[PDB]
Paper text:
LDH and MDH are homologous, 2-ketoacid oxidoreductases that share both a protein fold and a common catalytic mechanism. Both enzymes are found in central metabolism: MDH catalyzes the interconversion of oxaloacetate and malate in the citric acid cycle, and LDH converts pyruvate to lactate in the final step of anaerobic glycolysis. A key event in the early evolution of the Apicomplexa was the acquisition of a malate dehydrogenase (MDH) via lateral gene transfer from α-proteobacteria. Following a gene duplication event roughly 700–900 Mya, one copy of this MDH evolved a novel substrate specificity to become a highly specific lactate dehydrogenase (LDH) that is now essential to the life cycle of many modern apicomplexans.
In order to understand the structural changes during evolution that shifted the enzymatic substrate specificity of the apicomplexan dehydrogenases, we determined the high-resolution crystal structures of three ancestral proteins bracketing the key duplication event: AncMDH2, AncLDH*, and AncMDH2-INS. Each protein was crystallized with multiple substrates or ligands (lactate, malate, and oxamate inhibitor) and with NADH (resolution ranging from 1.35 Å to 2.05 Å). In the following, therefore, the descriptions of the models are primarily based on enzymes crystallized with oxamate inhibitor or lactate, which are highly similar. AncMDH2* is a strict MDH, and AncLDH* is a strict LDH. The ancestral AncLDH* and modern apicomplexan LDH structures are likewise highly similar (RMSD ∼0.8 Å for the loop-closed states), while sharing only 63–71% sequence identity. The first shell active site residues are identical in the AncLDH* and modern Toxoplasma LDHs, comprising the same residues as the apicomplexan MDH active site with the sole exception of position 102, which is replaced by Trp107f in the LDHs. The conformations of the ancestral and modern active sites are nearly indistinguishable, with only small differences in the specificity loop conformation. In both the ancestral and modern LDH structures, Trp107f and Arg109 are the only residues from the specificity loop that interact with the substrate. As in the modern LDH structures, ancestral Lys102 does not interact with the substrate but points away from the active site into solution. In contrast, Trp107f is buried within the active site, with the edge of the indole ring interacting with the pyruvate C3 methyl, which is the very chemical moiety that distinguishes pyruvate from oxaloacetate.
Numbering used by the authors:
A (entry chain B), D (entry chain B): 5 to 325
B (entry chain A), C (entry chain A): 5 to 328
The structure:
């Protein structure tokens, strides 16, 4: 027979469990929840299985502590890692501090994907995102087009939300992109913001939003992750990160050809190669099918190149490991 | 006790039945299917009721030949009318030719709305769309913001589909608008076409699509209704018209603040007033909450003005029929 | 690279188009609409393509007059045929009368499936259903588990709807089955009717529904097809037939293991073999994975045997046409 | 205008946040997340708002520490309270130990519902469920039909899941009910289990499942809450509890007339009155529209009456407060 799709979630914490719930609600495929912690993914899997009955969907949800159970996965989504570095306060939280803790985890996961599901489409979530995806790609041996990082969909969702809220319109009808590194130097593309294709500038000219308000939204987008960390007190965002990754997974599973900003392997686009960084891309059944090369202005391109330089700096730290 | 929403579909032919099906699938509210043909809406309503059981939804679907059954409707969607004018060939099909048959229907429907459900949001579909919505509005007494015509969502869906197909991307990520009259002088706004906010021009510059291909798509969008009429042999398009109108209805029922191109009553925007014509609008729980005035170029403005002039010419026929 | 599922709809009339619409709304897979009428499926496919843009789904819909386009289909759903026999009145409508027109179509469709998509799961809808599925199976060469007919899901949806309406409860929470032939001798299984597993008898005992009312509903379920034919004036039911078949298709495509009454090839269950007839079955990625043999009472068993005998009598006509 | 539905979630912990996510995914209505903890519901609300943009839905999600913000709610769902008593181990976890901690919370919530949204349909989740709903009802002054507890949908979902898993069929097609108290004396109704109306007994006779396996499933259903507690290590189930409560809320909001097992105010049915206990009911726009009185056998009725006696014992402890 043609089996149900199989989705393995490597990491069964807040984002992993939430993604599993979306899979159950949407009947996307059977789900494997893997974690190094004993019993916990098994507990969540039972709870999730009961929820599938409530939803009238048909999904097996298995919890496991064994990598062998990811065999034959169509999609693998990786959240394995730490959310907040040990001896730091909330206000000084930085994704950069997670690097030493999480890089070795990406090596281990990569080696197991190589062994058990080398044909999977792999979405990396673990921070610091752009270099974690690079470590995963290197150690997994997967094709460049079959690995990417989730960040841009989340950052863009934030930009969209804030603009849509200010304009008081449906976020379906706001198009907004944030490109570059998933960090303080991410680049919200104000010039490309549209309302059903209508340039945001028209709304400025009509006084429906001011440049000052847009500037504030741009900074709020950059700081959104830390804003939520400060408010939650424990851990970081998970509802939107989970939804973002599942949007990418759906695009793959049903060959949708979505245009989504993801951390993608560059091969000369934007003047850069051999790193992952946030760029608009077409996502379908062949993974990252196309990186779209925006006609950035020199000012936007300078911001992007500065963003890439932050990834290069992090990559030096990876090399040092 | 808060009742289910009530949606009346005045006209139970191809578009009306198909809209009722979407209401059943989406569990939007209870449905009244009204038609002048005896028994037919009753039969469709039974079939649709059975389909709601299959969908595991909770919807009453009532077929009727009595206007009284529209009482208390939250939304009314009007498709009553002819699709093709008697004695005309398919090749010479024109929405204009439907005017003398369908205008009188709009007057009658308006009179009934005025007494039975004057607080409804009303979406007109019947052709020729922009003048039919005006007749309905005038004879119903409804506020300007509570009546509009479905056309732009359909015309835009076509423009979007053709662009998305050529670029091989999801239509979710193509934004395209067609404004003006729902007819041969509709205005597909090439300058405003975007792929997730990326200007279509960027794709031209990279040779992903040519200007010639875009020109062809613009014409194909204008001709799409007639294309389908010619292929089908019977009637006209209904799957996408139905979905378009239901998208508008959902925006109202759940106060979504969607930005949708609809035929709206103008009060000076674009330099025009007192007609309905296709413009981007924000649709929510107050109906047409805002008409958006695009910063059109002189060239686009001239295309729009010529489109409005086609509506004015049809309005002369409305006046001549004694229906103002 | 794993391709989208491919669903071919052989027949692009009322049921075929409506199924394509559900496929577009639900994003089930790419759709091929095949028909013998030139241009019509092409026109519907355009309309449906536009509707997919509105739905924000990602579906290719292809209209065609060539069987070659069914190559590689995961699922085929067959509605090709007549709905009403020439020269007969609506009041005397009988599915039986469609047999000599539709049997030859099943043979032709089978021959094409045999060469172009022999690994498809095939759902037959064309009437008279139980013998049409047998002709298709025989001439297609497919395994017994990979062909079935849609009828029981529709007949059960009707029984469910009528019971739920009388009890004023959600049809999601009414379980009702109709087994046997898809015709006047179908068997609505009153003893098996439940409300979330609660026997219908409990509602009788409390006077929520009477035996007389249940008897009326049983007859109404049997007569439902003809009731809709009489009301509509043109054709027959399509909204619920379409939804029924798509429910079956989904069970296959996502290996759901649904318990659905379908016309299935019997191999001794109920003491019968080598015909298709309506029985509860488990539907999943291996097609008809299991026929469930109900513990029928002697009285129920006699009703079922009489239903099977109606199928046997129609099969005599199939043989006489030279179509075995 | 006719405004969007408004759903207030009193308690913004695991179940509250999860319910909010379902509201956002399903576009059910605007959501207010209330908690006594500062900042946390505001953080979750931001995360959830970003997720609504991803989902292309149109939902306002507000976090608050002020009861005034529940004004005009169509539905209120209450999870405010403790999940596990302080000085007890996981294996000895009991919903009964939560009584002293959670009863006063129900009084406070009730008084605020009375003040700010007396016309709401109110679903109580806080344990010990059947007596917590009684305290809420008493102090809120709401009509008997406008308050109920979520338990039976969850317990029944578990029974359904386990049976469906054993039979290898879709849980949509298994009907199963658990009635009585939401506790160790809940009553899984084996005799009423059906597969699309087909009695489970037919499957026994055919050897597709044994009586021993059914007996094991009945006990597993009773112990399912504690099974998940033991596996998770922190807190209790939330994915299925959240989905169960939202199923009940949907039935109200769209007047669906669902037949759902809920903890309902009895007025003589089953020989009992003036308490809440788990019974099948019709849920629609008038709340609990009808309690369905099953034709229980004497043996089933004895189990039910014993279940009710457990509620009466808990009610004595409530009285003592
Ligand atoms: N835009 C983005 O890319 C975002 C990324 N993140 C990142 O996602 C990651 C996960 O976040 P949450 O799920 O909230 O964290 P969490 O702490 O709730 O879950 C992480 C899980 O990873 C597990 N884990 C640790 N080592 C492992 C190994 N070797 N193999 C398998 N599992 C292992 C832990 O046991 C834990 O259950 C973090 O690194 C976080 O910074 C979070 C939000 C957005
Ligand atoms: N974008 C747009 O605005 C579009 C508009 N249309 C128009 O929509 C209308 C309906 O199209 P279909 O549903 O395909 O046509 P249809 O012919 O299938 O159905 C029209 C129905 O109107 C009924 N009718 C006639 N007079 C009536 C009265 N006084 N009261 C109630 N019902 C009455 C009929 O008996 C018939 O059932 C046509 O005028 C067509 O041109 C169609 C496609 C797109
Ligand atoms: N429960 C059931 O099993 C039900 C079965 N039916 C049956 O389904 C069938 C279709 O019904 P509708 O879609 O409403 O009819 P319809 O008349 O709208 O469409 C039938 C289509 O079949 C086509 N056709 C004829 N010969 C063909 C060939 N050799 N190849 C391809 N296409 C061909 C037509 O040109 C027409 O478009 C009828 O036989 C009807 O009795 C209808 C309702 C329920
Ligand atoms: N079938 C059922 O009825 C089930 C019931 N439960 C019960 O649901 C309740 C909540 O469970 P979770 O959400 O997992 O717990 P949680 O600990 O994650 O969340 C409880 C929230 O209530 C808040 N809270 C405490 N006092 C409050 C007050 N006076 N006003 C407003 N908020 C207040 C806390 O700050 C906390 O955020 C528990 O009592 C648990 O036993 C859990 C699972 C199933
Ligand atoms: Na791969
Ligand atoms: Na209509
Ligand atoms: Na119509
Ligand atoms: Na429109
Ligand atoms: Na327009
Ligand atoms: Na058009
Ligand atoms: Na047309
Ligand atoms: Na057109
Ligand atoms: Na078909
Ligand atoms: Na058809
Ligand atoms: Na069937
Ligand atoms: Na049957
Ligand atoms: Na029937
Ligand atoms: Na029929
Ligand atoms: Na019938
Ligand atoms: Na109330």
């Amino acid at each position: 027979m043609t089996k149900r799709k199989k989705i393995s979630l490597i990491g069964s914490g807040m984002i992993g469990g939430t993604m599993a719930y979306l899979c159950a609600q949407k009947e996307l495929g059977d789900v494997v929840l893997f974690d190094v912690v004993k019993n916990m993914p098994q507990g969540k899997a039972l709870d999730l299985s009961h929820s599938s009955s409530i939803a009238d969907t048909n999904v097996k949800v298995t919890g496991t502590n064994s990598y062998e159970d990811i065999k034959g996965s169509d999609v693998v989504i990786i959240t394995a890692g730490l959310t907040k570095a040990p001896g730091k306060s909330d206000k000084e939280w930085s994704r950069d501090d997670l690097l030493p803790f999480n890089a070795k985890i990406m090596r281990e996961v990569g080696e197991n994907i190589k062994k058990y599901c080398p044909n999977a489409f792999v979405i990396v979530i673990t921070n610091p995102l752009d270099v974690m995806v690079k470590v995963l790609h290197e150690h997994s041996g997967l094709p460049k087009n079959k690995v990417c990082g989730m960040a841009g969909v989340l950052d863009s969702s934030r930009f969209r939300h804030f603009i849509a809220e200010k304009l008081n319109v449906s976020p379906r009808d706001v198009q907004a992109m944030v490109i570059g590194a998933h960090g303080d130097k991410m680049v919200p593309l104000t010039r490309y913001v549209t309302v059903n294709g209508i340039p945001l500038q028209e709304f400025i000219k009509k006084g429906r939003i001011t440049q000052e308000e847009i500037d504030e939204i741009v900074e709020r987008t950059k700081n959104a992750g830390g804003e939520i960390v400060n408010l939650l007190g424990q851990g970081s965002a998970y509802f939107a990160p989970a939804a973002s990754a599942i949007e990418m997974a759906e695009a793959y599973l049903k060959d949708k050809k979505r245009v989504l900003v993801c951390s993608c392997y560059l091969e000369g686009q934007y003047g850069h190669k051999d790193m992952f960084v946030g760029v608009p891309a077409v996502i379908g059944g062949n993974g990252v099918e196309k990186v779209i090369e925006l006609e950035l202005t020199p000012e936007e391109k300078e911001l992007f190149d500065k963003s890439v330089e932050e990834v290069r700096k992090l990559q030096k730290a990876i090399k040092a490991l």
